[PDB]
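User: Can you fold this complex?
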Amino acid sequence: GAIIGL
Amino acid sequence: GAIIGL
Amino acid sequence: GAIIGL
Amino acid sequence: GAIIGL
Amino acid sequence: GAIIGL
Amino acid sequence: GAIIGL
Amino acid sequence: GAIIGL
Amino acid sequence: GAIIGL
Amino acid sequence: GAIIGL
Amino acid sequence: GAIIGL
Amino acid sequence: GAIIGL
Amino acid sequence: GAIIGL
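Assistant: Here's the predicted assembly.
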């Protein structure tokens, strides 16, 4: 999984 | 943003 | 699954 | 930013 | 895993 | 910055 | 998959 | 931008 | 995967 | 910039 | 992997 | 700059 952004 | 692989 | 947006 | 490999 | 950003 | 290999 | 844009 | 390989 | 942009 | 090989 | 930019 | 071989 990944989280991309601020 | 994006949350991937939930 | 994924969540894309703010 | 990016959090990868969750 | 990795964290990239501030 | 980058935190790698978590 | 891919996301292209701002 | 582009996010590739999700 | 890749992220290209600011 | 570019983040490659995620 | 690589990170290119500031 | 460049960070290579992560």
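Chain F is about 0% helix and 50% strand. Chains F and I do not touch (no CB pair under 8 Å).
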